[PDB]
Amino acid sequence: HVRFVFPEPTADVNYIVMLTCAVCLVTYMVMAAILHKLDQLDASRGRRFKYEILVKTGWGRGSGTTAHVGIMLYGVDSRSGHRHLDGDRAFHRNSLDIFRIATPHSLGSVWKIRVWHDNKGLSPAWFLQHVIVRDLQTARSAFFLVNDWLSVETEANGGLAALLRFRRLLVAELQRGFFDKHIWLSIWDRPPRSRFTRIQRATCCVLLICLFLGANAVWYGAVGDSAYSTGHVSRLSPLSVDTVAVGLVSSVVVYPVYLAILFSLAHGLSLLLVAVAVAVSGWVGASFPPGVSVAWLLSSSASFLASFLGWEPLKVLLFLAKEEARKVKRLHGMLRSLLVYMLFLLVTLLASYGDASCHGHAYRLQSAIKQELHSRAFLAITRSEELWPWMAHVLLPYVHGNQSSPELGPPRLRQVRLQEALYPDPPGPRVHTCSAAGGFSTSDYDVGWESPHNGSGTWAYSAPDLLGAWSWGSCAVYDSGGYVQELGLSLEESRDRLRFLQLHNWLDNRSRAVFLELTRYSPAVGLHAAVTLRLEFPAAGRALAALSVRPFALRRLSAGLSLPLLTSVCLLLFAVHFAVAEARTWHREGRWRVLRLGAWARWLLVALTAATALVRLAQLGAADRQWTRFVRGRPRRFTSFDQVAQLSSAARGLAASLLFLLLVKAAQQLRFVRQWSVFGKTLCRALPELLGVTLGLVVLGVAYAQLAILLVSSCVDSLWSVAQALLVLCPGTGLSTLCPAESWHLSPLLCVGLWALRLWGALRLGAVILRWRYHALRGELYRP
Amino acid sequence: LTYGMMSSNVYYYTRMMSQLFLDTPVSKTEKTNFKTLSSMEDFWKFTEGSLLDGLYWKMADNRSFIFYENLLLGVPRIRQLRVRNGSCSIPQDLRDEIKECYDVYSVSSEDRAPFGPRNGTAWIYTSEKDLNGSSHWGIIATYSGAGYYLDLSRTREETAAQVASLKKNVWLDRGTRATFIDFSVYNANINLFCVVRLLVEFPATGGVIPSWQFQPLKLIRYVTTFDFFLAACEIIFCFFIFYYVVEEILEIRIHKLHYFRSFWNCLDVVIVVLSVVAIGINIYRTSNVEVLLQFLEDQNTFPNFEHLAYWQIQFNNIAAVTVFFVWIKLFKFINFNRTMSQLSTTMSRCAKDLFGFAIMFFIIFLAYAQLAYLVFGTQVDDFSTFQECIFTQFRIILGDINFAEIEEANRVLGPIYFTTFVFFMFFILLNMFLAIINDTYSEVKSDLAQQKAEM
Amino acid sequence: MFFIIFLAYAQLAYLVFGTQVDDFSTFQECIFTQFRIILGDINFAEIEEANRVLGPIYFTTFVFFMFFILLNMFLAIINDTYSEVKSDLAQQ
Amino acid sequence: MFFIIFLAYAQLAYLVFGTQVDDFSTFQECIFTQFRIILGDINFAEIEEANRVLGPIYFTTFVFFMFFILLNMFLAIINDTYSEVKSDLAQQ
Ligand SMILES: CCCCCCCC/C=C/CCCCCCCC(=O)O[C@H](COC(=O)CCCCCCCCCCCCCCC)COP(=O)(O)OC[C@@H](O)CO
Ligand SMILES: *[C@@H]1O[C@H](CO)[C@@H](O)[C@H](O)[C@H]1NC(C)=O
Ligand SMILES: *[C@@H]1O[C@H](CO)[C@@H](O)[C@H](O)[C@H]1NC(C)=O
Incomplete structure (x- = not known):
């Protein structure tokens, strides 16, 4: 009663x-x-241990023949193979060849x-001591020869003729095919003179x-269709019992098709098979709730680990040479570095x-929130008495006005x-941002203002919270x-x-800030949004409005093993x-060495x-605590969420920067x-x-920036003739608004200077250098 | 053929239609138009408003001439696509103050049940097959061809009464997700039908997104002598395409089994494939004019011309690409003096190096694009999508950008992004291309001149 | 060659945007708009909303092949000719 | 040489558009408008309306001969001087 059920998902796509x-x-x-x-x-070529000891035995009579x-x-992570060499004597009778080659027998x-x-013919009765080697570079052998005699071409055993037993025959193969048939850890351990091509193995591994x-x-x-899986x-x-029990079963059931291609047309067959496998995996991947993708990843990792350690280990039971060695060592190092970097890139991509x-x-959520709250109307207020009408006409219908x-x-x-309490400048010309700042009040006040009769004031201070604060106002830094x-x-x-606050002078006396902010939830997309409205008051009659809508997703640490948790622990391990x-x-x-x-x-x-x-991790913990x-x-508890949104934004920015660095290094x-x-x-x-x-x-x-702002400060209504035409302002605001009143910040200066540097063709000078350099390097790799 | 298909000034036709329907304010007191719709009440004001003013023009139940030339064919049709209540899961600890949430639009979460005063087709689901409809691929998502539809009338009074009845018994509630309005006109002076489709999307997060489509078609082609001339030219084009196909097959079959290391044979097969696709599209489209015959025998029903407009757009795109590649093919023949040969040699020699450096250039470009998408993608309206980020950077190269918006989204990392982008794009990446091209040209000219002058 | 490519792009833009944008409503208008694109004084909102696919492709491809492959070739030709002329005159 | 060519175009623009466009009303306005055009500040609407022929021709020829030939000649001089200075320093 299982058969098969078609997922038939929506148009959504799972990116993991x-x-x-x-x-x-x-x-x-x-x-x-x-x-x-x-x-x-x-491909064609390559088909301390050797010392200056007597590696030849010419005292024998008729103890040699033309052969190999x-x-x-x-040894400890060391092995060898066969040898084949000859000269002019062509391996004559009892030839004493005291010579060694650059074999990989380390x-x-x-x-x-x-x-x-x-066995070049019949059984030879040769009695040679050994190819003695004592000490050349590392003394990897012993100066002792056993001079043991074996059968025709039989492997004469010795240390640094009828022994055929499992204690020697099979135990010898425990190091022979141990890493050659272990297809996973065999891409860099292929013995030469074999028909493997080192691409069939990788193709099978990716299969x-x-x-x-x-x-x-x-x-x-x-x-x-059993336990809703x-x-x-x-x-x-x-x-x-659900994460590994599926990986082991998948490995067991997939071995029968993997064993079918082992040692042509196998390359194309494997290509089309992996193509259809990835296609069906992508098609089925759409019907994946976010809580099961981590389970799928864990199952895949467990299956790979089991295949690497569970079955393949028991599968076996069924002059110019120094530069070549250095090059192959470099290639192996590059290969392992590539694997590590690819894993790191996958982790970073999953995190971001x-x-x-x-x-x-x-x-879209933040745009809709801005447009439904009349952001333009709030951002354009300048008097501390239109805030109450704005709240009466806009905010209150938005909160209690039941809607989505x-x-x-x-x-x-x-x-x-x-x-x-600040004495305001007479209205008219602007003042430089804000000025005349003192200290922050902390005392309590009853209804109206300072008037304690029995105990604490009705308008208590409501001491700031330990975590979640520092809105970073226009020219001040606040708390909670x-x-x-x-x-x-x-x-x-x-x-x-609202009428009680208006009639009782809650804001008119000092009027530093209002801090109107609650929250908003959207269950259709499952996103929260912290809305912050602030009126920073540099002086009486001077108003600065600030609106910020930050959308985020409330992922909690108590939810279990979320994908952010896995990415965070993987990133910690990599770091x-x-x-x-x-x-x-x-x-x-x-x-x-930090000098370079x-x-x-x-x-x-x-x-x-x-x-x-x-x-x-901090964002997850803060969200869980909140x-x-x-x-x-x-009933009426507020429990703001601004810190969670700020932490989410910071984490997203950091992940983006890390991915940027990884992509740049990949380009390098x-x-x-x-x-x-x-x-x-x-x-x-x-x-x-x-x-x-x-x-x-x-x-x-x-x-230029010094020149271009000492005459735009002379904005008034007419700057000059030449200075008005032969002047550059960086893109944006094609018709200059002039008069940089308290707005000549660092960023616009850099913008205008950098853009003026380009228009005049000053950056093209770089070509003048680069071309010359490119003409020199390309001539140093053709002739020499 | 391209001059014939791109006819005389039909730009003014669609211009007048659009400015009549898009730029007209919804009311004598309001300043909002269709292009700047904000909420659902604005949509209701537009429906019984500028739309009715622009549809019916006064001049037994006489027909409507929109500009005293454009004849309104049949009646317009309105349609709605909505989701069902309960397609949405909320946390169990929050199921005390909120009861209703509606998922985003999807075929699995569509609503297929009667609602309100279930009397006619406006309160009963009609399948896509029964509506002769198809998908649309709007802005937020791709919408089906089904929904709840109503066919309006020929006079203004009856249509106004129908719209008032729809509004009184609330028809656009929080469950709605899309609204379509469709009609067509003829304009018998020239021979050119026009199909008008207006779409309004109501996303789950809230708001309204409008879009429009005015498409001119020609379905009575053979009228004048120029039409016969165009038909003869089309037949000659078919003969030319057949000749090219035969030549390509013969010249690939006899010998030259490789055939692809030339770039002058891949272009030929690309042109042939595109032209054959265009011919097939035209043949399949021109034979499906049964909707016109069905409408002409009963002129009191909505005519279905959306498929013809879609296939006309596809044919236009294919023809434009084909003519562009045919024009590009001209480079094969401009080699007639020593000056023009060496430029081609330089380009062919530097193509490899240019591709090799362009790989790295595009990798760095996409790194910038992904960083911008991840950082500014939620506040700037210009980095909301990845391709939009790519286009925004390409415009930044031209200098067509507003620096004010990018810096106010992030005081830090905002100016840094723009500064480093402009610097490393105009000071480094733009000059390596010049270095490579100049070195290749210099070596080509030098070796050619030295071997030519020492022979 | 530069004008061959320019006319090919102009014809493509005329066929694609010739009825909606009003900056490509005529062939000469297409040529003038393409010359203005280099100056970077265009909208790109109307041309992107006129065709979501093959609209942005045209713009991006035109910008890439116009600022990266064509201007550098002109400057390379000028540089090489100037260097050759100066060397020849100095040798004279 | 560049100023000679610039004055030629300025006089042509003054004689053609000097009575309708308001950006070429006087000679200095023509010079400043051309300088602004070099920095990418074209209008092209009044220019098109004032003269449908010889208006676009002036703009297209100016853009082509300014952004592809004339302004690419300073960089050739700078590049050749840099090459000669570097070669002389290396040899000495
Ligand atoms: C007053 C004392 C010193 C004053 C210093 C103030 C100078 C102010 C900055 C100058 C830039 C630095 C030198 C750059 C010249 C070398 C590089 C160069 O000229 O680039 C070419 C020409 O560009 C141009 O516009 C060239 C504009 C003119 C700059 C060329 C130098 C003129 C100097 C004539 C007399 C000098 C000797 C007398 C001085 C005592 C190509 O450009 P590009 O493809 O990217 O086109 C982009 C397009 O948007 C702008 O047309
Ligand atoms: C929407 O469905 C919910 C149950 O999910 C129900 O409580 C509510 O009454 C429905 N809203 C209506 C009837 O409009
Ligand atoms: C769909 O087309 C058929 C003709 O094949 C027509 O009879 C039917 O009325 C059309 N559907 C609607 C909803 O009008």
């Missing part, structure tokens, strides 16, 4: 599966190029060696990965683009007194403290409270790994990753192509000249 598949395909695209380079390196010999010896000082010649992903996606999206018992938290559906909805996206919490008004008014719950009582690596390098390879670039980028990356992870505070009771590593290595080289070869040119440009831009 698509991103994972895209990463898994592009990593193979890079793997193919690197492994093809290494194969062409070891080999020595098999393994074995240790262990008493395990098997030397076997080739396994893609089929793991496809099987898990099909199980989580199609086979769900969602929420009831398959919770997103690791249950140890985990929820891309809410990003489009947040913009309910408020979810009463509003509140918070004031700071400043206890330093100040006298608070609840504004009431119903519309009728709200009118009475720890990078920090340990760079600290080890800085401590071992000399000291005081390269020791700064790694620290910057570590700091960025740590900041991202910690900010995300929700727990609000849930316990909501394109130099490995033969003809594409020039470009970056020139960019790092013309740096001093570009720095000198940009210093000159900075001086010229500063000079």
